[PDB]
UniProtKB/TrEMBL annotation:
GO molecular function annotations of the record: metal ion binding; RNA helicase activity; serine-type peptidase activity
A GO CC term assigned to this protein in UniProt: host cell
Membrane keyword on record: yes
Record's protein name: NS3 protease
């Protein structure tokens, strides 16, 4: 018992910048400072933007602020705390059946607004700042207009699907693949987030 370890916190290590005309990824913390911030849970870095790049000791993925909650996938974060200036922050939402977790949105973040447009012309934002057109095909499915090998989507779970007006429609959860090519995506609808809230 006296040697039992504790899992570290999720750590914000960058963001997808969507403030201007060009989307691009930014790193805000290197691997060494990440490992150390994960152990202490104390992250004094300024947070900005809607889409964060997050990491554990073993995985990297995305997290998206919607309605003052930073949302991501359970298969990336598990039950982990997230690092903050004052120490580890405990999850506010956890739903393994939806592959969903959430923490209070960090100070300085900006939150996306839940989409009420009812539109099926969507856009997926990846960890590499690619904006991928996606046609909505169901409550939790959308097809890529230009299929990609799954390699290009790996590490983007927790990222947003957006409507033409930039509202949040869903959280990227899983890739639908045949022989390594992503033809469609599975996502957590924003309405399922609003119900969890
Ligand atoms: C079929 C259509 C729907 C399902 C069928 O489709 C698939 O399963 N396809 C698979 C294809 C895997 C090949 C790579 C696909 C490329 C990018 C994908 C975007 C994304 C990601 O980037 N991840 S990640 O950032 O790299 C990273 C690993 C976090 C670091 N996602 C996943 O890899 C998920 C995890 C797991 O799926 C679940 N795991 C769960 C685990 C839980 O508790 C542990 C609870 C609920 C879960 N619910 C679910 C649904 C399997 N994934 C798939 O996409
Ligand atoms: Zn909208």
């Amino acid at each position: 018992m006296a040697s039992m370890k504790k899992k570290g916190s999720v750590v914000i290590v960058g963001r997808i910048n969507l403030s201007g005309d060009t989307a691009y990824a930014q790193q805000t913390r290197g691997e060494e400072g990440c490992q150390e911030t994960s152990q202490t849970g104390r992250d004094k870095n300024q947070v900005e933007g809607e889409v964060q790049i997050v990491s554990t000791a073993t995985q990297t993925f995305l997290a998206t602020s919607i309605n003052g909650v930073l949302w991501t996938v359970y298969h990336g974060a598990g039950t982990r705390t997230i690092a903050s200036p004052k120490g580890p922050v405990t999850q506010m939402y956890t739903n393994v059946d939806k592959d969903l977790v959430g923490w209070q949105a960090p100070q300085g973040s900006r939150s996306l607004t839940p989409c009420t447009c009812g539109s099926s012309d969507l856009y997926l934002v990846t960890r590499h700042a690619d904006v991928i057109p996606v046609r909505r095909r169901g409550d939790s499915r959308g097809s890529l207009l230009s299929p990609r090998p799954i390699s290009y989507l790996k590490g983007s779970s927790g990222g947003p699907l957006l409507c033409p007006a930039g509202h949040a429609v869903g959280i990227f959860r899983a890739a639908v693949s045949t022989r390594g090519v992503a033809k469609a995506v599975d996502f957590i609808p924003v309405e399922s987030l609003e119900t969890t809230m």
